[PDB]
Enzyme design. Sequence first.
Site, mmCIF file in Angstrom:
data_model
loop_
_atom_site.group_PDB
_atom_site.id
_atom_site.type_symbol
_atom_site.label_atom_id
_atom_site.label_comp_id
_atom_site.label_asym_id
_atom_site.label_seq_id
_atom_site.Cartn_x
_atom_site.Cartn_y
_atom_site.Cartn_z
ATOM 1 N N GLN A 2 11.898 48.376 -17.896
ATOM 2 C CA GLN A 2 10.980 47.979 -18.961
ATOM 3 C C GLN A 2 11.439 46.671 -19.645
ATOM 4 O OE1 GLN A 2 9.149 51.571 -21.688
ATOM 5 N NE2 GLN A 2 10.732 52.096 -20.237
ATOM 6 N N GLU A 3 10.481 45.898 -20.183
ATOM 7 C CA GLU A 3 10.677 44.632 -20.925
ATOM 8 C C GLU A 3 11.624 43.629 -20.274
ATOM 9 O OE1 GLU A 3 8.760 43.994 -24.260
ATOM 10 O OE2 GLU A 3 8.714 46.022 -25.132
ATOM 11 N N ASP A 4 11.261 43.203 -19.062
ATOM 12 C CA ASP A 4 12.004 42.235 -18.266
ATOM 13 C C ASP A 4 13.382 42.705 -17.767
ATOM 14 O OD1 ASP A 4 9.670 40.660 -18.647
ATOM 15 O OD2 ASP A 4 10.732 38.905 -19.502
ATOM 16 N N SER A 5 13.635 44.036 -17.700
ATOM 17 C CA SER A 5 14.870 44.497 -17.070
ATOM 18 C C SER A 5 14.534 44.969 -15.646
ATOM 19 C CB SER A 5 15.622 45.530 -17.912
ATOM 20 O OG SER A 5 14.876 46.674 -18.298
#
Lengths: 49, 299, 49, 56, 65, 56, 232
Positions: A2-5
């Site tokens: 999630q969120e650019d990971s």
Amino acid sequence: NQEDSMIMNQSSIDRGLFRSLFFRSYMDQEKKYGMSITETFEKPQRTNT
Amino acid sequence: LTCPECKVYPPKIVERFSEGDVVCALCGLVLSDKLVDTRSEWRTFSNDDHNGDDPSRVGEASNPLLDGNNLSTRIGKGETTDMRFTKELNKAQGKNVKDNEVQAAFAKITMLCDAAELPKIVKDCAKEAYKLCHDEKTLKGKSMESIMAASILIGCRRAEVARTFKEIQSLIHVKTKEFGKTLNIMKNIAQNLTYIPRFCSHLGLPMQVTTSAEYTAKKCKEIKEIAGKSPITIAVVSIYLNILLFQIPITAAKVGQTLQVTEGTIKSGYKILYEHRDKLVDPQLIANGVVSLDNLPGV
Amino acid sequence: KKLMAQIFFGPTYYQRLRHMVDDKIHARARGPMQVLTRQPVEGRSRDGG
Amino acid sequence: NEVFSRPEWMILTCLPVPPPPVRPSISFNESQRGEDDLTFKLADILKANISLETLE
Amino acid sequence: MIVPVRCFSCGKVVGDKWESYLNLLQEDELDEGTALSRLGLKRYCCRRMILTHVDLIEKFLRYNP
Amino acid sequence: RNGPNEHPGAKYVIRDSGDRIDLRYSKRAGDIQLQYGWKVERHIMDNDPVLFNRQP
Amino acid sequence: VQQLSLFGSIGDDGYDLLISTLTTISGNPPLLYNSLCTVWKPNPSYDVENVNSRNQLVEPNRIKLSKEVPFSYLIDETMMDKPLNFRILKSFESCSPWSLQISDIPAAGNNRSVSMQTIAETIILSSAGKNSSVSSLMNGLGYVFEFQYLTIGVKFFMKHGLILELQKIWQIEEAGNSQITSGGFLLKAYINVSDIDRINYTETALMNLKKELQGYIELSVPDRQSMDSRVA
RNA sequence: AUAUCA
Ligand SMILES: [Mg+2]
Ligand SMILES: [Zn+2]
Ligand SMILES: [Zn+2]
């Protein structure tokens, strides 16, 4: 992931995926400070240093 | 520092820089907490900031060994500046200014080393030799352009930079006997191997020739084959022997020209060494063309 | 168990970038201080706060 | 203010000299020593002063 | 640089297959896709290992010491 | 007792006297006997309140 | 184990008065006792790093072996037929069981009301095999005999586990035993503590004994460094 | 001081 990971295949990492070499280089001079004072390359002894 | 609790004569203490503490290694007592980074602190004095934007850059480094302690800024042009006030405040510094001007004789040493191709460590010895002998009563009234010409060979003779006195006679100026007496009154207050690299280079010889000449000349001295001839002559002679032994030869006229010696003199040393040519050469020398020990000129 | 969804799967050229966690991670709790201001020194490098 | 700020006190006659903490020095290696810009600027003030005192 | 032993994704030894692949191309003139498949490299994870390799070692060897 | 290297451990012991004991080097880091009022500078542990911040 | 203690001393002439005082104060006359202690240190011929398997600093220390001996081994012929009581002190295959002890330097602290020492002890009951002598066994552990001393004295059992020993110490060597306590007796008051409470309670007991003897005989905390057996 | 990071 999630969120650019992102998730990596730990199995693949072991097999060499994305490993890299790393080389750092340290430098040092033996400087001469005038007529008398000169730095030295040696193993310092803790009593007189 | 010594731990107040323990007190052992060799006081074993560590500088745990990372935690900013000074500890006693035995009992573990912290002996100091305020601890400063000397590298970064020194970065505030000698930085890379020449523009003037760094707020960390706040001081400047000086040299108390050479110029004593003369702190002094210079009136110069800034961003918002009238070219009038710079002139006045500079014309005002003129009335406040003799020996504070003889420091321009450092500019004479610096411009001489750079004309003689000399390293940064030699200038600073020549400037310290000149500062400690230019106002001496032991030098009194020696030729003032020959006492700084003597303090350059004093700075070279400690920094291990091979410079013959005739090499400094070419620079300035030197009156030989005048800067030779001055090189001794200050001293109270070269070899064969030295020239070989330069002479050979000008000669245009290979490393092989240089090495052998270098070996012969040393052996010549070791053997004491040349009783009192000047090292320059010895070297030029040895260069002659080795070179003649190899393919690319050089004549006496050409060797002498480079060494700045005369053929007759090179002849003099050469013949003295020739008898022991065999002993002189490096052991794995390879005579080439047609010049073996037997065949060498012998002149 | 089969996923109720079908995954968009295939090779894609991925790059390894210069920013690695271990060269970034930093922690301090009392350490070197400046001389002038007597305040914590700067940057990870210097064990700054 | 008659106590804390008389106008006569704007023109400098005496110069407070700040202590080393305000202008630290560092002694590197006997031929390297670093003084603070203020210590430089002060020395110029002094030199310029000593000069003008001799002139008067 | 230098063929990976084992495919990253599944770990099928791919270390032996290099010279054999390079041979099926020069000596057999065969196209890349058939050579890979001949060598039994069926899954694309395994295929990408050989197909996209850059054997830099061979340049590295060109320097003397 | 756990010390500076083990996770739930500690780094320093602060006596009433004011002087700091470095558990990393003190020869008495083992046989350290605590007294009410002393301070143990211990590691950050699960459920401690901490300020977390993202700049700007 | 934590041993809290206080020490004192008296010269030979102060004996009878002290015995009389402690007998009235405690309610019981003294009890004669002795002990032989042998101290061992790491073999200097062998050398090992001073660190853990976890690479943690370990300080080398001495090991103390102690046991009793039948009194008859301390009475020669001149000593023969003399009341085997407190007054006697004035006229001065396998291994046996032993007490093995390693102690730590007393707890740090300015203005300590008592000395507090941690003591690691185990008991040796017996041995067997090739080299079964206690000496060989100590060597097997990597230690060597350093020195040994005999202590003879009288003890008093008091309340709350407080014990009082009036002792004389003799170092033993072929060159001869020398009396470390020549001149008088070493006085020791202590309690062995296996919770903060019982520790502050024990301190109090010792403090009351110190208080009760103030004026007559003084009991104080010895220097930590004098109770440190570490090798160096 | 330039480069860079979100
Ligand atoms: Mg972001
Ligand atoms: Zn200490
Ligand atoms: Zn695969």
